Ligand binder design. Structure first.
Ligand code: ZN
Ligand code: ZN
Ligand code: ZN
Lengths: 707, 50, 170, 125, 147, 210
């Protein structure tokens, strides 16, 4: 690996490396050596874990997960690896060097902070000091995080403290305003929930039909007398056929609503009881043999689930609004409960008897009824500590960005502080534009929208500027342009006697000009529109080998006859031409018009979980594509541009979301942003707590930062 | 646990491999206990016991 | 026949288009009338623009600029011999010109570099270790954060970006 | 003109008054149709030698073989190279280095300085 | 606005808690070097490079309003001293500050006013090098620059 | 050149106001809802004599919901910045027509005296004001935004009775909230917010307008 780094350094000094997208050549180089040294550590790290014998007590502590980990084994047995500080290799402290022990500009691994040794062989002197540098960043990080998080937590508790669930189970604060109609939108307790799988998100419509449908045609497989017992006698029933056919009709409709609720296609939801483990407790105790024939009537199952559905009271009432509240609030548990306890599912898979099923119904009823949150509780305070706690956990400014772009979407506590304050001017605002279908599978369409979205000022497009003295173009000092002057004899042939003899000539960079796909008439029309008709412009052909633009300034002709004393106080036009030259650059906003410009990068996403679509088979599918990620805020206008998605275009900046999309859209975006920051550690803070947090800040339309 | 061959070993017919832990009717049938069985895990023995 | 005209500006624009067609004397060896063709071109442009605006004037000049290119006399020769009809010459929709050659490559090369600006941006980490228990792919990333720790020891976090799935080592 | 040209018109930012020793400024002569340079604090005036009065950016004055003095050849901290041939003198051994500037431009490319008193020659590769 | 605009050349100087910033060329004129050719020489005595010289050029143009040392001293006084009446004490007060409080380490007498001017100029030069990027910024922690 | 975009925009804003008219329930033609860009271009026969007062012609009436109580009227002023004078004539126009509500779409901005005058129009006919750029795209289609439905005063009465609340104790929403503006609701009215929920699947809220 060291020879391979010297090899990459040899390629780099030759000037021929060919840089990586969106990066300077040093970054391409730095990204590459960093890839090699990391791969070097991981290869020998994987070698040492293999080489360990069965009896290594060190491996026995790592494997139980008691204390310590794989990386420690890597460092003690193998090789410690590249140290870094602020996410980069050890800086050049002295003139172009880390220590006087090295040569100036020495990008090798060791010379800039790679530790070749293991803790067991001991570190060499330079490695020790670069290791002592890696030691500080962690000690300092510790002292800061303790102060900041102590403050963030106190402020948060101090807001929410008076929120609490009342005895009619609506959650209200001190002045008795309602926060939620039901706590956490279902009225369940957070300590009684569990992760569960939703059966009905099963891919393929045909596959769902096969596994769930209770057939009546009976395939010659001992039908009616296989699995089920006396049920062979109710095969002739019309009513039972129509009622189950009605059951399956609800399951297709539930499957359809459930696909709308979870568009991403995750089956993991928090719900009470865990119906599947209960069926197992039920099977295990009654001594149910799954090969022996069944002893259960299907209608007993279907109606029993209806009755249980009615017993699971979460909203007491009787009028149409209470029934709708009861029905919608425990929609997600109810569709889950029908899916688990399905007649075909029950009969084939779980094989439960009648006595076992009646008992099972009775426990779920008792556990669900026990799960409903206890009014009186302090819910507001409970939530602040569950939010406060992950701010305690990890990362202040450490870089682990793997989204192939800018560092942007600041990670960790400083980002949390921004959402918490609702900063009118975030340190790093962002915005994600998704692109319309056709323009998303093609690069060239993507390039054309990208250029329209970018914001570039003529100063960036200009290679160079010059100002010349040339009263007579017909004998211009710039003899090569002379061909153009003859080309523009008919270009207003009369007011050449009147226009100022001062000349501005601009030359444009050829690659950069082409990249924006601009044409000269666009520039001329832009500059004409900005300064006015007074600014007399001419330009050469876009296909000449030296792409050039020539600018003069025309007056008002008739009235300028030295009336009083020229109401300009006799400003020389050259001096004025600099002010035109200055402002022409600083002002001209072609394509993109405000604060975002072309800051772009363009990205291909195939890694993430984007563009999740439905297919006619019924199953979900991945749809890779081009998406545009910007580093700026202008959501109101940027939505209205063509082929930009008016649906999934989003921004991390909650103040701009407020302006455009109102208070409810803030409530969601802020939740996603708070969820997303907690999710970086992925300790998974329970959602009900963040809903409560968002509701308190968005409670009264106007944004109420907790400041 | 580290054990076996994630994603394709249990499908390699279940030569019990002893790694995976199974408990039934209050008796430990097979496997080895670790932090993922006993720790602060979402599905640890301790959570189920409560 | 060439369409009738009376405007003095239109007449001089034809004369200039004709004069541009006179460049390099190729018109002699072919023997094609540059004055009838320039008039037909100009009529076709005017049929597009319908006046003698700056935009028409810019188009006349760019038509002139195409005729006067020193590195591509073959474009003119193609117009002179009728390989390009005047109605086609009148419109620059059909691209711009690609027989001086190197500049077309360069514009292609520009089209490469902005496409180079699309390539990944900067792909990441790529440790490639454990297999995911969801979408059955090994393309995975790992996170190393909180060294020593308070009481949640530097455990190893592994995430499957392929479907946003995260699990721990052990 | 020709593509293989250059743009060093001689930006004469210095041409002080022969009398009061201060800077000359442009000003028009409409009578003679010629640019002239005059001191503001006095009548003295003289015609210009160029039609230019100001330029900006070149963007790539890559600035590769200027400012850096040959004597940098003496510095013990710079890497001596066994790589041969001063393209001027028939002698090997050169000190080399890179950028050493904040307008780093991204110039990763190496600059080599001959070290024997016969050249002081400064090339690039 | 429509002045020339360009703010990124306007080099000024804070003198020790003077209630107002002063343009650097005025300070040079207060030292007595009224000739611009001389001021330019004191900033950079290697005028083979047009770019840096052009860079200072608008600040010389900005200075143009005054070209006498006495007036420049009265100017700094008004830019320093609370409002009053006579000009002459203001010139003297301004003179002792310019003499004693301006880089004392280079001298505290009349007879070394010229040498001080040289040090100011290397300092402006030291500044211009960083703005062109010819020379890396100083490090805020380099122990070599601590006592 | 930009003129050619305009047609897409004029098509595009007319379509958004149609959906807006349709959500309020003013019964627009399904075909007007269905109207494509190509048809609209066909409808004003694009390309001739630009800058022509297409928008004065684009001015449309919309009649309905459930009870034909006159109509709602939609006006696109030709002027980039509309002043009180254009409003006064427009007022003469709304009064002659005896219409009941007027929506004006201004291309850049309205003079503050006109907004004032719009304020003083409040007792009589109601005037609603949209900035052309925010109207140019249907915000209510966006994924962040849950389904909003306005309730009648009777339904609000039953709601407060059945939960036993005071008007004051409900969650509030801005009178200038882009969504509140979209429906054009006034103070005291309640909006029913219907949301997808990770844990409820569906969750229903109400917000009293403040
Ligand atoms: Zn996966
Ligand atoms: Zn003079
Ligand atoms: Zn030599």
């Amino acid at each position: 690996a060291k020879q391979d780094v010297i090899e990459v350094i040899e390629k780099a000094h030759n000037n021929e490396l060919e840089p990586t997208p969106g990066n300077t050549l040093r970054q391409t180089f730095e990204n590459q050596v960093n890839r090699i040294l990391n791969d070097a550590r991981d290869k020998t790290g994987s070698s040492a874990q293999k080489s360990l014998s069965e009896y290594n007590n060190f491996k026995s502590m790592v494997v139980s997960g008691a204390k310590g980990s794989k990386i420690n084994i890597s460092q003690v047995i193998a090789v410690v690896g590249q140290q870094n500080v602020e996410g980069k290799r050890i800086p050049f402290g002295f003139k172009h060097r880390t220590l006087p022990h090295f040569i100036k500009d020495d990008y090798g691994p060791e010379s800039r902070g790679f530790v070749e040794n293991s803790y067991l062989a001991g570190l060499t002197p330079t490695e020790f000091f670069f290791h002592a540098m890696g030691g500080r960043e962690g000690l300092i990080d510790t002292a800061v995080k303790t102060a900041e998080t102590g403050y963030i937590q106190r402020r948060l508790i101090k807001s929410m403290e008076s929120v609490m669930v009342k005895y009619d189970a609506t959650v209200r604060n001190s002045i008795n305003q309602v926060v939620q109609l039901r706590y956490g939108e279902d009225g369940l307790a957070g300590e009684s929930v569990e992760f569960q799988n939703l059966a009905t998100l099963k891919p393929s419509n045909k596959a769902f039909e096969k596994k769930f449908r209770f057939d009546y045609t009976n395939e010659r497989a001992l039908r009616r007398t296989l699995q089920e017992d006396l049920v062979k006698d109710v095969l002739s029933n019309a009513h039972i056929q129509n009622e189950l056919e009605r059951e399956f009709e609800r399951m297709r409709e539930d499957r359809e609503v459930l696909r709308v609720i979870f568009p991403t296609g995750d089956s993991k939801v928090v719900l009470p009881c865990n119906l599947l483990r209960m069926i197992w407790n039920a099977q295990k105790i009654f001594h149910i043999n799954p090969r022996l024939p069944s002893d259960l009537h299907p209608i007993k199952v279907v109606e029993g689930v209806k009755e249980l559905s009615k017993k699971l009271v979460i909203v007491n009432g009787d009028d149409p609004l209470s029934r709708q509240a009861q029905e919608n609030a425990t929609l997600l548990f109810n569709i889950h409960l029908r899916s688990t306890l399905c007649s075909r599912r029950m009969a084939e898979e779980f094989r439960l008897s009648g006595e076992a099923f009646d008992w099972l119904l009775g426990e779920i009823e008792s556990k669900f009824n026990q799960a409903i949150a206890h009014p009186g509780e302090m819910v507001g305070a409970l939530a602040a500590q569950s939010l406060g706690e992950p701010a305690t956990q990890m990362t202040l400014n450490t870089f682990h960005y793997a989204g192939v772009s800018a560092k942007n979407v600041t990670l960790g506590v400083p980002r949390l502080k921004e959402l918490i304050n609702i900063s009118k001017k975030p340190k790093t605002p962002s915005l994600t534009v998704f692109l319309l279908g056709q323009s998303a599978r093609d690069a060239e369409r993507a390039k054309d929208i990208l250029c329209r979205l970018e914001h570039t000022t003529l100063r960036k497009v200009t290679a160079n500027t010059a100002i010349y003295y040339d009263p007579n173009p017909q004998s211009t000092v710039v003899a090569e342009d002379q061909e153009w002057v003859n080309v523009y004899y008919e270009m207003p042939d009369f007011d050449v006697a009147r226009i100022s003899p001062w000349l501005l000539r601009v030359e444009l960079d050829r690659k950069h000009m082409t990249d924006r796909k601009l044409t000269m008439e666009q520039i001329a029309e832009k500059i004409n529109a900005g300064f006015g008709d007074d600014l007399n412009c001419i330009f050469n052909d876009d296909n000449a080998e030296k792409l050039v633009l020539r600018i003069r300034i025309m007056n008002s002709d008739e009235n300028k006859m030295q009336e009083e004393e020229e109401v300009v106080d006799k400003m020389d036009d050259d001096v004025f031409l600099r002010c035109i030259e200055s402002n022409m650059l600083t002002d001209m906003t072609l394509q993109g018009i405000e604060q975002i410009s072309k800051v772009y990068m363009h990205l291909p996403q195939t890694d993430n979980k984007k563009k999740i679509i439905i297919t006619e088979d019924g199953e979900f599918k991945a749809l890779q594509e081009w998406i545009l990620e910007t580093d700026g805020v202008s959501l109101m206008r940027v939505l209205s541009e063509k082929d930009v998605d008016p649906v999934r275009t989003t921004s991390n900046d909650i103040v701009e979301i407020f302006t455009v999309l109102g208070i409810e859209a803030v409530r969601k975006a802020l939740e996603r942003e708070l969820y997303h920051v907690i999710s970086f550690d992925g300790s998974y803070v329970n959602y009900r707590h963040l809903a409560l947090l968002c509701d308190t800040m968005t409670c009264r339309g106007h944004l109420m930062a907790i400041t | 646990t580290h054990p076996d061959d994630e994603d394709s070993g249990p499908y390699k017919h279940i030569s019990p491999g002893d790694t995976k832990v199974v408990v039934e009717n209050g008796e430990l049938i097979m496997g080895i206990l670790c932090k993922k069985s006993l720790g602060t895990s979402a599905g640890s023995l301790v959570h189920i016991s409560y | 026949r060439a369409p009738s005209t009376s405007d003095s500006v239109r007449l001089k624009c034809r004369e200039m288009l004709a004069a541009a067609l006179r460049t390099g004397d190729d018109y002699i060896a072919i023997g094609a009338d540059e004055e009838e063709l320039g008039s037909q071109i100009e009529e076709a442009i005017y049929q597009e623009i319908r006046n003698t605006d700056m935009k028409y004037k810019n188009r006349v000049r760019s038509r002139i600029s195409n005729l006067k290119d020193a590195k591509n006399p073959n474009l003119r020769k193609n117009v002179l011999c009728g390989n390009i009809p005047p109605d086609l010459f009148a419109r620059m929709t059909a691209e711009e010109m690609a027989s001086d050659e190197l500049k077309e490559m360069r514009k292609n090369l520009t089209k490469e570099a902005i496409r180079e600006h699309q390539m990944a941006k900067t792909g990441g980490t790529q440790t490639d270790l454990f297999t995911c228990g969801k979408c059955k792919k090994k393309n995975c990333t790992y996170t190393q954060v909180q060294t020593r720790s308070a009481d949640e020891p530097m455990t190893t976090f592994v995430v499957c970006n392929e479907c946003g799935n995260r699990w721990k080592f052990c | 003109m020709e593509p293989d040209g250059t743009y060093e018109p001689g930006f004469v930012g210095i041409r002080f008054c022969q009398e009061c020793n201060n800077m000359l400024y442009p000003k028009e002569d409409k009578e003679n149709r010629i640019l002239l340079y005059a001191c503001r604090n006095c009548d003295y005036q003289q015609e210009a030698d160029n039609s230019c009065i100001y330029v900006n950016k070149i963007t790539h004055e890559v600035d590769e073989l200027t400012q850096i003095i040959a004597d940098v050849s003496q510095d013990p901290t710079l890497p001596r190279t066994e790589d041969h041939p001063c393209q001027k003198c028939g002698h090997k051994e050169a000190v080399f280095f890179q950028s050493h500037s904040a307008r780093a431009e991204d110039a990763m490319r190496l600059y080599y300085v001959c070290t024997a008193p016969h050249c002081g020659h400064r090339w690039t590769e | 606005g429509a002045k020339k605009s360009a703010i990124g050349q306007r080099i000024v100087a804070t003198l020790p808690y003077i209630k107002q910033e002063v343009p650097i060329i005025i300070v040079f004129r207060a030292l007595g070097f009224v000739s611009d050719r001389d001021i330019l020489e004191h900033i950079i005595y290697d005028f083979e490079d047009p770019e840096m010289m052009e860079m200072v050029k608008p600040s010389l143009d900005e200075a143009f309003v005054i070209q006498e040392q006495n007036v420049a001293l009265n100017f700094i006084g008004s830019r320093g001293a609370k409002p009053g009446v006579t000009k002459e004490k203001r010139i003297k007060y301004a003179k002792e500050v310019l003499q004693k409080e301006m880089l004392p380490h280079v001298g505290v007498s009349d007879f070394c006013e010229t040498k001080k001017a040289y040090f100011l100029g290397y300092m402006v030069h030291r500044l211009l090098l960083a703005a062109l990027g010819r020379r890396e910024l100083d490090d805020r922690d380099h122990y070599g620059n601590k006592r | 050149m930009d003129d050619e975009e305009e047609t897409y925009r004029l098509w595009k804003i007319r379509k958004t106001i149609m959906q807006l008219c349709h959500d309020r329930g003013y019964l627009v033609t399904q075909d007007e809802l269905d109207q494509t860009l190509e048809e609209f271009k066909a409808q004003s026969g694009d390309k001739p004599s630009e800058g022509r007062p297409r928008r004065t012609d684009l001015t449309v009436l919309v009649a309905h919901n459930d009870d034909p109580t006159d109509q709602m009227f939609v006006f696109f002023p030709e002027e980039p910045k509309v002043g009180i004078k254009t409003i006064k004539v427009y007022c003469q126009r709304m009064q002659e027509e005896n219409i009941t509500r007027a929506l004006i779409v201004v291309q850049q901005g309205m003079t503050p005296s006109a907004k004032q005058s719009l304020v003083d129009m409040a007792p009589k006919y109601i005037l609603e004001q949209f900035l052309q750029q925010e109207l140019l795209i249907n915000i209510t289609e966006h994924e962040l935004v849950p389904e909003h439905v306005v309730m009648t005063k009777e339904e609000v009465t039953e709601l407060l009775a059945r939960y036993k609340l005071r008007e004051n104790q409900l969650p509030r929403i801005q009178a200038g909230d882009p969504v509140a503006r979209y429906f054009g609701i006034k103070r005291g009215q309640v909006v029913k917010i219907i949301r997808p929920s990770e844990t409820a699947g569906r969750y229903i809220t109400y917000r009293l307008v403040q």
